[PDB]
């Protein structure tokens, strides 16, 4: 039981004036009439990143959307939608987006001049495909006018009325194009790629289909969040990015000149930043696949019968998660009897598993040492079975490009020196 | 290059075995056991009565496992587990474990560690120790006909194919029993042991059928299509409910695998107890 009268009077009723958060948004400049356009019709422009997913309530986000709409979403007007360096942070809930459609009158939105969407991207797409029941009524609007390029909203809009965000305006994309850049990927399209003063924008060639509609995607990546910069080959490059999983590759036939640019404008940010070297101490679960690796595989050989069908499921899932390879075949199940005899199993596993994962040797040898100390007299001997076959793994780390990964081996030979000294009867 | 000092050679070893510290033990494995891979011969020496010596060596083996407990992790790998990769040597070998098991008893310790054992004998050779585990307990259960009994708790043979069970069930984890060629004769003896025996060896039935039935979605050898997977996934999962628990008789009992196996097997032997037994309906 609720409509636009209704909501109304319960934001009205409410204090939402003197919350001290209301003001806030006003600050935040989201929403903001900017002048007309050439029809005369006002125009708003709603910034994406101004707005987080749950930081702020959404009630008070929509009256003040309301509220600026209410002296003139009589007459026809013309919004603008900022959906620069989209992501996953600013996003609409499925709950919370389907309120707009019922929490206005319904007469406004007959009276939506036109649309214009800005610097949009491939995660605004992917939004839509997976809200596109919600978004139904928008697809193949007439109403939403993509802006391809730059040089054509200010043609449509009133030029020196245009009050677009300022952050947005500071890039410019007024940096160096490498024209023909090809994004090697599942699938090949054209790239242009602007490293820009302090982000780099990838611009594709080629129009793509966005509610039914051509337009250029436009993913921008702030240079502060280019964390890795590799260069593999001068035929490619490759471009790590925080929580992407696998990195971006370009092909172009200078990459070390885009690499360059990118250090150097990598490098002149490290000077700004006041205090780098402190972050991280936060790992991810796919930070750590090798850890989770000697857990399992260490409990599997427990006195418990309980215990050990737990760690054959953790075991199953860690498979599937993270695509490792094995012999046989694993399926979860609950109310598994495994034997306490959970040997000869446990090994067959560890030399497959070190045999075809080198990468997993470092992390998983630094656990499976500190867990050798913790472990029970009969349980180090466990330990010493699965041990061995990864450690003819060093081989390739020992002169891994001098990378500061040869100090880590250095502190896992110093342990194990220390295991002999103590374990006499071992 | 000297076959001939094995029989001499290894009765020493195991001798002088007890006498010598913990880590003086350890050392002793290293060098003996490359002898063991020369009873093939002797094995089969034209019935010399060389191949009883066999036999008391491994007895002596068997005392050694059971009371070095601290070491068993690497008896198994070391020992039983090359011991296993004798195809004429199987046959005496699991005949010793089998009259280790049945002087001990049901519930003796001897018993529940000599199952144990045969995890790691199997793994060299599923194919045949599966294929004659199976071949034993289906002639017991045959031989009952010759001495009638109105009850098979009753009858003189209980012992055996209880003990045998045990075996049975160890070596169902992992596919270690072959289903792929064995599945006739496993429903065959599971619909005889249902409900059947103490709370403890009622557990272990189910447990039993439970284990099968996951080495037939994690096995290679049969091609079943993504359509048959998805009712096998099921049908596990409809065993697990507590329906199957009443039909099983062990209603009253959170999990199985716990009864099913008991912590403290190697310190003491089992204790049964609360004869007192649940009655079996035929719908069931």
Request: glycine share 4%; with cysteine; charged share 20%.
């Amino acid at each position: 039981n609720l409509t636009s009268s209704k909501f109304e009077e319960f934001m009205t009723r409410h204090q939402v004036h003197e919350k001290e958060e209301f003001k806030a948004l006003k600050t935040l400049s989201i929403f903001y009439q900017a002048g007309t356009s050439k029809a005369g019709n006002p125009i708003f422009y709603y910034v994406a990143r101004r707005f987080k997913t749950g930081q702020i309530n959404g009630d008070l986000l929509i009256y003040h959307v309301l509220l600026t709409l209410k002296p003139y979403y009589a007459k026809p007007y013309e919004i603008v939608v900022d959906l620069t360096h989209t992501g996953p942070s600013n996003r609409f809930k499925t709950d919370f987006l389907s309120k707009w459609f019922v929490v206005f009158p319904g007469f406004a939105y007959d009276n939506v001049s036109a649309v214009y969407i800005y610097n949009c991207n491939s995660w605004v797409r992917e939004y839509t495909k997976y809200h596109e029941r919600l978004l139904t009524g928008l697809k193949g609007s007439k109403r939403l006018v993509f802006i391809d390029c730059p040089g054509k909203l200010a043609e449509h809009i009133e030029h020196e009325q245009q009050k677009l965000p300022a952050a947005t305006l500071a890039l410019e994309e007024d940096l160096k194009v490498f024209h023909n850049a090809l994004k090697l990927a599942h699938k090949d399209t054209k790239v242009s790629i602007k490293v820009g003063s302090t982000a780099v924008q990838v611009t594709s060639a080629e129009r793509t289909k966005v509610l039914g509609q051509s337009v250029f995607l436009n993913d921008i990546y702030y240079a502060s969040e280019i964390e890795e910069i590799c260069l593999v080959d001068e035929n490619q490059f490759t471009l790590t990015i925080a929580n992407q999983g696998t990195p971006l590759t370009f092909m172009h036939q200078e990459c070390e000149a885009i690499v360059q640019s990118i250090i150097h404008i990598r490098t002149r940010w490290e000077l700004s930043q006041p205090d780098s070297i402190p972050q991280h101490t936060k790992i991810r679960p796919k930070d750590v696949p090798g850890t989770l690796l000697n857990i399992a595989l260490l409990n599997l050989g427990s006195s418990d019968p309980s215990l050990r069908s737990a760690a054959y499921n953790l075991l199953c899932a860690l498979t599937c998660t993270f695509n490792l390879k094995i012999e046989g075949q694993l399926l979860e199940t609950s109310g598994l009897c495994i034997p306490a005899n959970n040997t000869l199993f446990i090994v067959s596993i560890s030399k497959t598993l070190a045999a075809n994962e080198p990468h997993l040797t470092l992390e998983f040898l630094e656990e499976c040492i500190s867990g050798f100390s913790k472990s029970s007299i009969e349980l180090k001997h466990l330990c010493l079975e699965y041990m061995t076959p990864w450690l003819s793994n060093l081989v390739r780390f020992c002169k891994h490009n001098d990378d500061a990964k040869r100090q880590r081996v250095t502190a896992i030979l110093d342990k194990l020196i220390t295991m002999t000294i103590n374990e006499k009867q071992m | 290059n000297e076959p001939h000092l094995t029989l001499e050679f290894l009765e020493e070893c195991i001798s002088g075995f007890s006498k010598s510290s913990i880590e003086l033990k350890h050392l002793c494995l290293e060098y003996m056991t490359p002898w063991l891979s020369n009873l093939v011969r002797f094995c089969k020496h034209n019935d010399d009565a060389k191949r009883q010596r066999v036999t008391a060596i491994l007895d002596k083996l068997i005392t050694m496992t059971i009371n070095e407990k601290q070491m068993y992790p690497s008896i198994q790998a070391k020992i039983w587990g090359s011991l296993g990769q004798i195809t004429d040597l199987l046959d005496v070998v699991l005949d010793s474990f089998i009259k280790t098991s049945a002087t001990g008893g049901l519930g003796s310790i001897k018993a529940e560690v000599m199952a144990d054992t045969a995890v790691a004998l199997a793994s060299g050779n599923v194919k045949l120790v599966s294929s004659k585990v199976i071949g034993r307990m289906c002639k017991i259960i045959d031989k009952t006909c010759l001495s009638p009994t109105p009850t098979l708790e009753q009858h003189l043979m209980w012992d055996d194919i209880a003990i045998l069970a045990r075996y049975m069930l160890m070596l169902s984890f992992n596919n270690s029993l072959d289903v792929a060629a064995h599945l006739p004769y496993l429903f065959h003896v599971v619909t005889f042991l249902v409900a059947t025996g103490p709370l403890s060896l009622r557990a272990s039935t189910h447990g039993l059928v439970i284990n099968i039935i996951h080495s037939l979605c994690t096995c290679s050898q049969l091609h079943f299509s993504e359509e048959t997977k998805q009712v096998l996934r099921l049908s596990l999962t409809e065993f697990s409910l507590p329906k199957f628990y009443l039909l099983f008789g062990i209603s009253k009992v959170k999990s199985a695998a716990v009864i099913a196996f008991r912590s403290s097997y190697r310190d003491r032997s089992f204790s049964p107890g609360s004869y007192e037994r649940e009655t079996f309906a035929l719908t069931s």
